Amino acid sequence: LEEKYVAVMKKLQFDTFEMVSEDEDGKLGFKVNYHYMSQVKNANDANSAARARRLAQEAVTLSTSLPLSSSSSVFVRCDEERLDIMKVLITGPADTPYANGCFEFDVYFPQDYPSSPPLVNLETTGGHSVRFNPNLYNDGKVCLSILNTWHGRPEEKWNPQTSSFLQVLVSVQSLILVAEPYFNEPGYERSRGTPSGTQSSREYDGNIRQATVKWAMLEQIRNPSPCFKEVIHKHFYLKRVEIMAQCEEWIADIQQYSSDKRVGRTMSHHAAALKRHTAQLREELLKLPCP
Amino acid sequence: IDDALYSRQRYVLGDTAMQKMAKSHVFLSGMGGLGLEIAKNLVLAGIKAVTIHDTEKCQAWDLGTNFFLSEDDVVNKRNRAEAVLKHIAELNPYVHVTSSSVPFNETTDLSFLDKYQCVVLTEMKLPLQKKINDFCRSQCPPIKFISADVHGIWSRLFCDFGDEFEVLDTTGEEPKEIFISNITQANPGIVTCLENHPHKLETGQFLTFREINGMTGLNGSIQQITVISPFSFSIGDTTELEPYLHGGIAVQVKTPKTVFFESLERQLKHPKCLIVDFSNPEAPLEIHTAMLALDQFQEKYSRKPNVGCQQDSEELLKLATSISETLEEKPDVNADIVHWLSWTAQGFLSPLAAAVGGVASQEVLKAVTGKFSPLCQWLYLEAADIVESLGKPECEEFLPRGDRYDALRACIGDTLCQKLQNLNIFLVGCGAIGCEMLKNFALLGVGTSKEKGMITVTDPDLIEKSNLNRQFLFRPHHIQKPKSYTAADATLKINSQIKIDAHLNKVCPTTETIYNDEFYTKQDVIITALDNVEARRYVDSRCLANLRPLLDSGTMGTKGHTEVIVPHLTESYNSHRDPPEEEIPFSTLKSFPAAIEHTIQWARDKFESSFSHKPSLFNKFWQTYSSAEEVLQKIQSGHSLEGCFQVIKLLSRRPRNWSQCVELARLKFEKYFNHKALQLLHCFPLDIRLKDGSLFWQSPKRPPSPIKFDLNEPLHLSFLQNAAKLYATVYCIPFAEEDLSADALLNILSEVKIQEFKDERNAIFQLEKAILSNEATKSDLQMAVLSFEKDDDHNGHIDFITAASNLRAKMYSIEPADRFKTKRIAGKIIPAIATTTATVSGLVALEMIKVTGGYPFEAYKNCFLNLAIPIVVFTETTEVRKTKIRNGISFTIWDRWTVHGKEDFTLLDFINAVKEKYGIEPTMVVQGVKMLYVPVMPGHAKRLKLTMHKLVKPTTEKKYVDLTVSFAPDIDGDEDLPGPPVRYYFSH
Numbered sequence A: 001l002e003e004k005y006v007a008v009m010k011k012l013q014f015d016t017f018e019m020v021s022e023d024e025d026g027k028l029g030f031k032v033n034y035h036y037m038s039q040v041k042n043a044n045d046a047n048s049a050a051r052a053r054r055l056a057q058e059a060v061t062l063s064t065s066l067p068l069s070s071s072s073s074v075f076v077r078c079d080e081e082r083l084d085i086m087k088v089l090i091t092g093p094a095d096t097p098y099a100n101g102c103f104e105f106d107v108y109f110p111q112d113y114p115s116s117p118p119l120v121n122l123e124t125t126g127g128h129s130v131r132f133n134p135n136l137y138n139d140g141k142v143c144l145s146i147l148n149t150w151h152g153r154p155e156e157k158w159n160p161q162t163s164s165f166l167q168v169l170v171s172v173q174s175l176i177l178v179a180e181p182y183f184n185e186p187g188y189e190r191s192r193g194t195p196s197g198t199q200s201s202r203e204y205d206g207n208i209r210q211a212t213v214k215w216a217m218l219e220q221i222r223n224p225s226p227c228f229k230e231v232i233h234k235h236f237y238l239k240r241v242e243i244m245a246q247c248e249e250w251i252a253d254i255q256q257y258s259s260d261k262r263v264g265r266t267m268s269h270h271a272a273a274l275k276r277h278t279a280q281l282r283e284e285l286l287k288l289p290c291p
Numbered sequence B: 001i002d003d004a005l006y007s008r009q010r011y012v013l014g015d016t017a018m019q020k021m022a023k024s025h026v027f028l029s030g031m032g033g034l035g036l037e038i039a040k041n042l043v044l045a046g047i048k049a050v051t052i053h054d055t056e057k058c059q060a061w062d063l064g065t066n067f068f069l070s071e072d073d074v075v076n077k078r079n080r081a082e083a084v085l086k087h088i089a090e091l092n093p094y095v096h097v098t099s100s101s102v103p104f105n106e107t108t109d110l111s112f113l114d115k116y117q118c119v120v121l122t123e124m125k126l127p128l129q130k131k132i133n134d135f136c137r138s139q140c141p142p143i144k145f146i147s148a149d150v151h152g153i154w155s156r157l158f159c160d161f162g163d164e165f166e167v168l169d170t171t172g173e174e175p176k177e178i179f180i181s182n183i184t185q186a187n188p189g190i191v192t193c194l195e196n197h198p199h200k201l202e203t204g205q206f207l208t209f210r211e212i213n214g215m216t217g218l219n220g221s222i223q224q225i226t227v228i229s230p231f232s233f234s235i236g237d238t239t240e241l242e243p244y245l246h247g248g249i250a251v252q253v254k255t256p257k258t259v260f261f262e263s264l265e266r267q268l269k270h271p272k273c274l275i276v277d278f279s280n281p282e283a284p285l286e287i288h289t290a291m292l293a294l295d296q297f298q299e300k301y302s303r304k305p306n307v308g309c310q311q312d313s314e315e316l317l318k319l320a321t322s323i324s325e326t327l328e329e330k331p332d333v334n335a336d337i338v339h340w341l342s343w344t345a346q347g348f349l350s351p352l353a354a355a356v357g358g359v360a361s362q363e364v365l366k367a368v369t370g371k372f373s374p375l376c377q378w379l380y381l382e383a384a385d386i387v388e389s390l391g392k393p394e395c396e397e398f399l400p401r402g403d404r405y406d407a408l409r410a411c412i413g414d415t416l417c418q419k420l421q422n423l424n425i426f427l428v429g430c431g432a433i434g435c436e437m438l439k440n441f442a443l444l445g446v447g448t449s450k451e452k453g454m455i456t457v458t459d460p461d462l463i464e465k466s467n468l469n470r471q472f473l474f475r476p477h478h479i480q481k482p483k484s485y486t487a488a489d490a491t492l493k494i495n496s497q498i499k500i501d502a503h504l505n506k507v508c509p510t511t512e513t514i515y516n517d518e519f520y521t522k523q524d525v526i527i528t529a530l531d532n533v534e535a536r537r538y539v540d541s542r543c544l545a546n547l548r549p550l551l552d553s554g555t556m557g558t559k560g561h562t563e564v565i566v567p568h569l570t571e572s573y574n575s576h577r578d579p580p581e582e583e584i585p586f587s588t589l590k591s592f593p594a595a596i597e598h599t600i601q602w603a604r605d606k607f608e609s610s611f612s613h614k615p616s617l618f619n620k621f622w623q624t625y626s627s628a629e630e631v632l633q634k635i636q637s638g639h640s641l642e643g644c645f646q647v648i649k650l651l652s653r654r655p656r657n658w659s660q661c662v663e664l665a666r667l668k669f670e671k672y673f674n675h676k677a678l679q680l681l682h683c684f685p686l687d688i689r690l691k692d693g694s695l696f697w698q699s700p701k702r703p704p705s706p707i708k709f710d711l712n713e714p715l716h717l718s719f720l721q722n723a724a725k726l727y728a729t730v731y732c733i734p735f736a737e738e739d740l741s742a743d744a745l746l747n748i749l750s751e752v753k754i755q756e757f758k759d760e761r762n763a764i765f766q767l768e769k770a771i772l773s774n775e776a777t778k779s780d781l782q783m784a785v786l787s788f789e790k791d792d793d794h795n796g797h798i799d800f801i802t803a804a805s806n807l808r809a810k811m812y813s814i815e816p817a818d819r820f821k822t823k824r825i826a827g828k829i830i831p832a833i834a835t836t837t838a839t840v841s842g843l844v845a846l847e848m849i850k851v852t853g854g855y856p857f858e859a860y861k862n863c864f865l866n867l868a869i870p871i872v873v874f875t876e877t878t879e880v881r882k883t884k885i886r887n888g889i890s891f892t893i894w895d896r897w898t899v900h901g902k903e904d905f906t907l908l909d910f911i912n913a914v915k916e917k918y919g920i921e922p923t924m925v926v927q928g929v930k931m932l933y934v935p936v937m938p939g940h941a942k943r944l945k946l947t948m949h950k951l952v953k954p955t956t957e958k959k960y961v962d963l964t965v966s967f968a969p970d971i972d973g974d975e976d977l978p979g980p981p982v983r984y985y986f987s988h
């Protein structure tokens, strides 16, 4: 199965899609939702030239070096004319609360690139109502040392000579989406191994599981973005059995702590929400036509 | 102190300096060009009382140096001091100006000078200057003495502040703050700075400590340091103190400094000059020798040397040789300098006078306030480079002709003056520097020729009250009028023959249609007076595409710089790509502040989010969908909507009257300054520890604490009032000023409770409730949008921001900030003053002459100055750089290749044409930011068989487009070699 999954998806890692249309007046008309509309419209300066060379060089790497496996993969789309517009879709790794999710990001390159790191924004926040990770604020801001410019450490900054976009993508996938996101927060690792820490981690994991089942699969299937529509439909169609098994296991595991008193109410609430989500997701998957 | 007029100057001088500036009287003698410049700068500064004194009468020769006289004044033979009295008082009504005409000589009684506190002398014979200087320095208290003179293209400046002078601020930079990491109970103790962040200190400075755990003895003490490493230093014995636990903050302490001066007569035997050009460190001594010889000659013969009479030159050279051996240091005699001083003894150069006047005004301010370090003890500026390239001109070219340009003609010669009157110069921005540049242009007669000559100035802004402090061409009755038109009208009065074309456009890519390439080709030099880097870069890129010289300058407080760009000789502005600047980390700004800047920035961002972004989103959402019932039906059908929850939540909590607005403000206050602290403490208790055991609530993090509301506290009342007003304005609820009283607020809040501290269905229910309540009318789906206006004293913006920032700072136990500092930080106001702008304008005016004359590369100079030290540095402009790609082919930034095509030209034809013509084959073609041919990405393989005309989609007005190309590297895996831009012509 995994071999077939790798074979089918390998043709869709990199491509181009039409996002911006220009009228006779030079005005820009966006056909898809984009987070950085104002910066694109205002920054019309054509002085930048090294940015084009850097992006053209990067396009060579991005065409072949993107990670691709059954556990996780990356998909990239870029505009048919401009070069400073990109959308990234990342599937969550296995054996984590983000398993088999479909998260969408917006990437914009400033004029002075690569002297400054690009801007990244998370879009699958569920209307800013969900904080998916301690490093992923509910407003959509994604924070990493490599994307930031401050005092810090000389090796912990956006180095124009060595830093590359592929490093940013791999760092996001490998460090943000981990097995136990609760311990990413500094100051909690001291309580690692304690029963209280374990209970808190379980509560956080249950919340994240229900949130990702809601806003990462059902909403994506019902209202896919135009750019990644085919990728989404082919991805979910091929992994329905595993998705059902994973959801059943998640429902079973959560109720094991419903008898507790400290977190019993929250666990019961999470389990009820997960059941309600899964009831509709089953119908949605059953009605998915074959691509 | 009316801040509306001195807002910019306070950030430079300071409140104590402002107080000392008042109750000060300055005596100024000599109303030539230099005296006029000094008087103008002083009056704009804001001195209480200024007395001008002169004894001669106006002459036609004066019209070329004085920008306030008129033909009628010359006709009536008025005294020079009186003819300028009325106009000068117009600059500032707060300054009391008086004129005097008492004769000066050896037998004049100098008793009346004791009333004043600073004396400036100009155009005075040497012996009387000696006598006056001897008299002034012997007073108790001593009276400061300053002398200045300009002859031809040479200047001299001198200072004397008595035997001993006291300075209360050596440099003027704000002290930095450091965090202690470790202390040692040793003799001497060793203090280790935190990880990274070097202390940037030097031995001999003094520090004070606070907030130290364990070593309580060092809190509030003062110590003198000794640098050991970039991350540590030394303090005295601490073996008798407790062990150091954690924490600790040290800040630098300023210390008064005492300097010494000498009498003028003593200083004439071995001056302590100031070096401005390190290429010729011995130049100031020779210039001093020549000036002294000139003064001796003028005393002996009662006249200045005549141009071209070689016997006068020989006599001056002999006198200079006689004086030089008498000097203590015994230097050499520079024949060239003596010859050129003899040549142009009777001239007068306006920009040099302006620069010297700016420096002298700064010196007078230092003398009266004691704010900065004074000059010690001489300053010699000159512009010899202008005539160094003239070779051996004839004497007849410098003879006067009987017009207003006699001084300039005697300075530089007739030919260069004629080449000046035919300039077409394009000026961008009409700020503080713009007005000075216009005044200099009027004085030099730029573009006054009937046949050819034009000056273009563009500026979209309007005149503002605070702008009157620095720009002297504007008047109080000119508020809310275009800067360009007012500047043109003011300039036309100085010189009648000036031809000025003024515009109102803003230089930007959108307005590129009017400022096409033909306009730039018509121009001969471009001068910038902008305040932001983006406009500078855009103008530089535009000028680079047409091979036109560019002059750039900028100032900030007491620092300024000038830059010169010449085609085919120097690098451009973009060759100097500058480093970026630290941005506050997201986590320090949001939850862990450490300084007042963080709280101010947080308040600004909260204001923006609460009053600008949300109203825009609300209006856009409710104009996307016509009716609320339609939205409810779409929601009930499961259809997704963008940001529906936020807008529906805003709708549910909509206020209806004044009382609801007050209650909303109270709830916002409670949520902002009470619940956040409790939540933060709940998530992280005070005693939590990291892996290594250190407390999490350590430096630089500071623990928070809740604040209880109290109407009696003035800060609480101010915040409540400002929030209520802003929300009432945004929701468009009428209100009256009586409702802002304390008693009314008490009455309204008497019945408001506070909730204690601890989705789709709810949103649908609230929307249905609003629908059934007839709250979904067209008027209800409308919200006013506010914009930040820091110059308005009644919109309440600054009051709200300041109150919020102070409250948040007191939550985290940080020192609060007043209104003015908060305004400066939030608005990013750049401090400015008149002296630096005048100086940089003079220097730019000097460089324009060299640019016009077409002098070789060695003549141009770049200047960086800081009057606070003071320090002036002249360097040669950066040379152009050769860059090669392959096969020995090289190019500069000024190169540009051309390709001629036709109607049926294809991309492959273009590639082959470039390959044949220049020898290498491009691998990628991109038009600006829109690509045209990238082999890697799919679909571009077939693009090789397309017409260029279709592929470019140009506009009919333009006959050519510019493209960027790159070439394959010799070794695979390397970045492609950049290439010069290529211009493509559609047809012959």
Ligand SMILES: O=P(O)(O)O[C@H]1[C@H](OP(=O)(O)O)[C@@H](OP(=O)(O)O)[C@H](OP(=O)(O)O)[C@@H](OP(=O)(O)O)[C@H]1OP(=O)(O)O
Binding pocket: B590, B606, B609, B610, B668, B671
């Ligand atoms: O929109 P923002 O400027 O980012 O401010 C929000 C907003 O507070 P305000 O509306 O009072 O400005 C949130 O409230 P909602 O509008 O979403 O209801 C609030 O959320 P809580 O009510 O849950 O406190 C959140 O605070 P937080 O991120 O701590 O949840 C806070 O963000 P900031 O005050 O940090 O900007």
Ligand SMILES: Nc1ncnc2c1ncn2[C@@H]1O[C@H](COP(=O)(O)OP(=O)(O)OP(=O)(O)O)[C@@H](O)[C@H]1O
Binding pocket: B428, B429, B430, B431, B432, B433, B458, B459, B460, B461, B467, B483, B505, B506, B507, B508, B529, B530, B531, B532, B535, B830
């Ligand atoms: N792109 C532009 N095109 C034209 N004029 C510009 C442009 N950018 C800035 N300016 C002008 O530059 C001038 C700068 O003047 P200055 O530095 O004295 O301060 P200011 O903008 O008047 O205001 P403040 O002193 O309060 O900062 C302004 O008059 C502004 O109109």
